Design an enzyme around this catalytic site. Structure first.
Site, PDB file in Angstrom:
ATOM      1  N   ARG A 184      -2.287  38.529 -37.386  1.00  0.00           N
ATOM      2  CA  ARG A 184      -3.341  37.699 -36.804  1.00  0.00           C
ATOM      3  C   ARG A 184      -4.693  38.301 -37.197  1.00  0.00           C
ATOM      4  NH1 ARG A 184      -0.866  36.183 -30.809  1.00  0.00           N
ATOM      5  NH2 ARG A 184       1.278  36.930 -31.188  1.00  0.00           N
ATOM      6  N   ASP A 198      -4.492  32.886 -39.695  1.00  0.00           N
ATOM      7  CA  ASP A 198      -4.367  32.162 -38.442  1.00  0.00           C
ATOM      8  C   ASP A 198      -3.310  31.073 -38.639  1.00  0.00           C
ATOM      9  OD1 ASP A 198      -4.677  30.665 -36.075  1.00  0.00           O
ATOM     10  OD2 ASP A 198      -6.485  29.672 -36.832  1.00  0.00           O
ATOM     11  N   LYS A 248      -2.068  29.048 -36.773  1.00  0.00           N
ATOM     12  CA  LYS A 248      -2.282  27.868 -35.948  1.00  0.00           C
ATOM     13  C   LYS A 248      -3.254  26.883 -36.589  1.00  0.00           C
ATOM     14  CE  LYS A 248      -0.476  28.614 -31.512  1.00  0.00           C
ATOM     15  NZ  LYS A 248      -0.475  29.316 -30.191  1.00  0.00           N
ATOM     16  N   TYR A 287       9.562  36.484 -32.627  1.00  0.00           N
ATOM     17  CA  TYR A 287       8.940  35.767 -31.500  1.00  0.00           C
ATOM     18  C   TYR A 287      10.034  35.084 -30.668  1.00  0.00           C
ATOM     19  CZ  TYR A 287       4.995  36.289 -34.788  1.00  0.00           C
ATOM     20  OH  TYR A 287       4.073  36.791 -35.677  1.00  0.00           O
ATOM     21  N   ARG A 288       9.650  34.510 -29.526  1.00  0.00           N
ATOM     22  CA  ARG A 288      10.554  33.713 -28.709  1.00  0.00           C
ATOM     23  C   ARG A 288      11.074  32.555 -29.550  1.00  0.00           C
ATOM     24  NH1 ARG A 288       9.078  34.358 -22.327  1.00  0.00           N
ATOM     25  NH2 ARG A 288       7.018  35.300 -22.641  1.00  0.00           N
ATOM     26  N   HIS A 290      12.753  43.643 -22.780  1.00  0.00           N
ATOM     27  CA  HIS A 290      12.582  44.809 -23.643  1.00  0.00           C
ATOM     28  C   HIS A 290      13.947  45.409 -23.734  1.00  0.00           C
ATOM     29  CE1 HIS A 290       8.272  44.906 -24.307  1.00  0.00           C
ATOM     30  NE2 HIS A 290       8.154  44.438 -23.079  1.00  0.00           N
ATOM     31  N   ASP A 291      14.074  46.444 -24.586  1.00  0.00           N
ATOM     32  CA  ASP A 291      15.395  47.049 -24.906  1.00  0.00           C
ATOM     33  C   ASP A 291      16.190  47.304 -23.629  1.00  0.00           C
ATOM     34  OD1 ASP A 291      16.922  49.741 -25.125  1.00  0.00           O
ATOM     35  OD2 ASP A 291      16.572  49.396 -27.274  1.00  0.00           O
ATOM     36  N   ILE A 292      15.544  47.871 -22.620  1.00  0.00           N
ATOM     37  CA  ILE A 292      16.259  48.299 -21.435  1.00  0.00           C
ATOM     38  C   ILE A 292      16.911  47.107 -20.753  1.00  0.00           C
ATOM     39  CG2 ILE A 292      14.279  48.012 -19.873  1.00  0.00           C
ATOM     40  CD1 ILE A 292      15.191  50.490 -18.516  1.00  0.00           C
ATOM     41  N   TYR A 352      18.090  44.298 -22.373  1.00  0.00           N
ATOM     42  CA  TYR A 352      19.189  43.808 -23.214  1.00  0.00           C
ATOM     43  C   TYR A 352      20.434  44.665 -23.054  1.00  0.00           C
ATOM     44  CZ  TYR A 352      15.055  41.604 -25.174  1.00  0.00           C
ATOM     45  OH  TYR A 352      13.866  40.919 -25.316  1.00  0.00           O
ATOM     46  N   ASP A 399      16.726  48.055 -29.509  1.00  0.00           N
ATOM     47  CA  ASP A 399      15.718  47.723 -30.523  1.00  0.00           C
ATOM     48  C   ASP A 399      16.176  48.008 -31.956  1.00  0.00           C
ATOM     49  OD1 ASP A 399      13.896  46.568 -28.758  1.00  0.00           O
ATOM     50  OD2 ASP A 399      12.580  48.341 -28.691  1.00  0.00           O
TER      51      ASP A 399
END
Ligand SMILES: CCCCCCCCCCCC[C@@H](C)C(=O)SCCNC(=O)CCNC(=O)[C@H](O)C(C)(C)COP(=O)(O)OP(=O)(O)OC[C@H]1O[C@@H](n2cnc3c(N)ncnc32)[C@H](O)[C@@H]1OP(=O)(O)O
Ligand SMILES: CCCCCCCCCCCC[C@@H](C)C(=O)SCCNC(=O)CCNC(=O)[C@H](O)C(C)(C)COP(=O)(O)OP(=O)(O)OC[C@H]1O[C@@H](n2cnc3c(N)ncnc32)[C@H](O)[C@@H]1OP(=O)(O)O
Lengths: 354, 354
Positions: free
Chosen positions: A37, A54, A56, A78-79, A120-122, A124, A150
């Site tokens: 970005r 960018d 977007k 990303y999600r 976060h990793d913990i 999962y 991770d």
């Protein structure tokens, strides 16, 4: 230099597993272009070219699709839905490049009740039995840093995914989508415990198994200087060698695998190791098959001769970084290129002939 | 049915990373032939054909070379020199197959002062700073099972090497040797901490960092029922959500990152979590971004809906085993074929034409 010389990778700037996966590709010789970005001090961003866009904007999306159209691999963490909304979903990229290995790096996966949820990793490794298995039994579980979700069960599986699909592409002529979820990868990472559980060889009790700390021959011991050694003497002959260096009479000890007497055995071993400093045991075993090693802090690693002689690390400015793994006999990897200045995205597009 | 369909692999029977690496190749569709010494309940040995040979005999060595001659990959995990003395070393294999990816899986590496020394995962991570970093700060280090050495920095790097060398073979028309040392692979696995240490973002102090248990917003908590939740609410917005769900007033708490007051912050979160059962918290933080998840034991994993819905596990005779990872959209893997009876080595040669 390395075996991946010639591979073109587009990385969509993220955190954790995605940039670690892209690093390893770069380490092994791939041409990795990272889109961020609009010089880094993060050594993980070695072996890159950084461009900025960018995604977007109309313009930003156009160039990225031109850069993706000339690439083998795309990494995004990303999600689910994010690249889709951006106009950079797999269905979109296919229209410009059906040879693209579209590699999607997530914790929860692409679908399912948790697929849109932060984590976060913990998190999962909490859902799949792993975290529950880590730590001493008298205490709540400890996170194995973010090594298991991770990286071990994350970037590493993305990597196998990418290269396996590259192999499949030779005969198909086409790419596909790789869906790498930390929850899946870490499960397969720990398949050995799943196997052992089926046969009575692993229990859900934390800290009371062969390989989690429960066994006196597979655990650390504090020494007289308050530093520690690691004991890994599973096989009877290595265990024998360990007792011999400690000067303990085996006839005076409980058997190695009598679990009823394990606390007795550990008290005897703890007394032995406590009688001298780490560097003493350091020296007494240094050369044997006793599976006994010094527990080094990061700051001590660069002084260890086996580390030194094999060039496991190199100096960047201001500290040691690990050299590329694994090692290749014909096409060896170069020392990593440090993070450099962000470059003009049009320069890369000309270079790649996009 | 996976991406590695068509890939021919010879595995020399071993322990830990070699067999775990072999399993994943078979998972993804490889044709794996495991040569053992003269029907298994070990789930790790899925997706194999098993043959038997005495590699110390003239007939046994000859048969292996005929099999290796027709393979893409050879996996061996013995001490360096062991295959050489058998007459199955890289130089011997070169004479019958110079397209062979010769993958050597060790802890200490092919060379170096410790290369002839016995060990196990805990040793390899003791020497490179990893083990020292795991555990609570008050007590000795705890091994993170053998996830970090054997697998995450072991078999996973062997896999990356094998697959990268296969990409390389596309243009060179040749194999080479892959030297995957656990001590190297695990160092690359923990590269984020080597990055952070260089920039003042990680300390050698056990249990006093962001991701090692030292942060109250990144750790497990014990609940009213004696079970645990994992918290990983690093980002301020995820942290805010966590506090809301606990019923806590942020103005009544120390700032999230005031490390001076971390023990205060931890005590208040501890009190909050201990006021309800683990499953109450899953209900509370079901769909939210609080980064709060239940810490499930292996025996409970099959009841978790996100696990169930995504088919992360399959039922094999015995118990649950992880399905292959990662996932592929066009050439998806099959459910693993269970371990089967040993077959005639000669039938394999007829099949492979060797
Ligand atoms: C220290 C490391 C921490 C360590 C312990 C870890 O475990 S890190 C692993 C964390 N988890 C994951 O990576 C799993 C997959 N990822 C995720 O779930 C989420 O990305 C995270 C990490 C939870 C972060 O969530 P978030 O902050 O809401 O961000 P996301 O929902 O991914 O959406 C990202 C938004 O940013 C935008 N974006 C991205 N690149 C560009 C660009 N070049 N130009 C313009 N915009 C960009 C995307 O459009 C997206 O926005 P929107 O579509 O959500 O509106
Ligand atoms: C239940 C526990 C007890 C089982 C054994 C413990 C493992 C179970 C624990 C779970 C995983 C352990 C976990 C913590 C790990 O770290 S696993 C990885 C351990 N490390 C490595 O693999 C690094 C590379 N390997 C090594 O250094 C050594 O192989 C080990 C693992 C230390 C074992 O030492 P070792 O038993 O002396 O083995 P080597 O020195 O390789 O000698 C092997 C000899 O066996 C022979 N051999 C093999 N296959 C055949 C065959 N089919 N036909 C005829 N002969 C065969 C070889 O020729 C060789 O003989 P020679 O070279 O000694 O003359």
């Amino acid at each position: 230099a390395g075996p991946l010389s010639g591979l073109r990778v587009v990385e969509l700037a993220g955190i954790g597993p995605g940039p670690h996966a892209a690093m390893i590709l770069g380490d092994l010789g791939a041409d990795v272009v990272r889109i961020d970005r609009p010089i880094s001090r993060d050594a993980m961003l070695r072996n890159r070219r950084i461009v900025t866009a960018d995604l977007k904007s109309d313009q930003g999306l156009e160039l990225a699709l031109k850069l993706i159209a000339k690439a083998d691999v795309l990494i995004e963490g990303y999600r689910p839905g994010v690249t889709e909304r951006l106009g950079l979903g797999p269905e979109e990229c296919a229209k410009v490049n059906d040879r693209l290995i579209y590699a999607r790096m997530t914790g929860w996966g692409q679908t399912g009740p948790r697929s849109q949820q932060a984590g976060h990793d913990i998190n999962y490794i909490s859902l799949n039995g792993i975290l529950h298995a880590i730590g001493r039994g008298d205490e709540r579980p400890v996170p194995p840093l973010n090594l298991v979700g991770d990286f071990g069960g994350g970037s590493m599986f993305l990597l196998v995914g990418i290269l396996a699909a590259l192999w499949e592409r030779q005969s198909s002529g086409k790419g596909q989508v790789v869906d790498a979820a930390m929850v899946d990868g870490s499960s397969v990472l720990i398949q050995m415990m799943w196997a052992m559980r089926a046969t009575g060889m692993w229990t859900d009790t934390r800290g009371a198994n062969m390989l989690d700390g429960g066994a006196p021959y597979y655990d650390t011991y504090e020494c007289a200087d308050g530093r520690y050694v690691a004991v890994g003497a599973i096989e009877p002959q290595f265990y024998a060698a360990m007792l011999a260096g400690l000067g303990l009479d085996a006839a005076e000890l409980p058997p190695q695998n009598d679990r009823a007497r394990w606390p007795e055995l550990r008290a005897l071993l703890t007394e032995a190791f406590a009688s001298h400093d780490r560097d003493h045991w350091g020296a007494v075993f240094a050369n044997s098959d006793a599976c006994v090693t010094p527990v080094l802090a990061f700051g001590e690693v660069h002084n260890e001769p086996h580390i030194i002689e094999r060039n496991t690390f190199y100096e960047a400015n201001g500290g040691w970084q690990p050299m590329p793994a694994p090692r290749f006999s014909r096409t060896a990897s170069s020392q990593p290129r440090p993070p450099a200045a962000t470059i003009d995205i049009e320069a890369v597009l000309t270079d790649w002939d996009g």
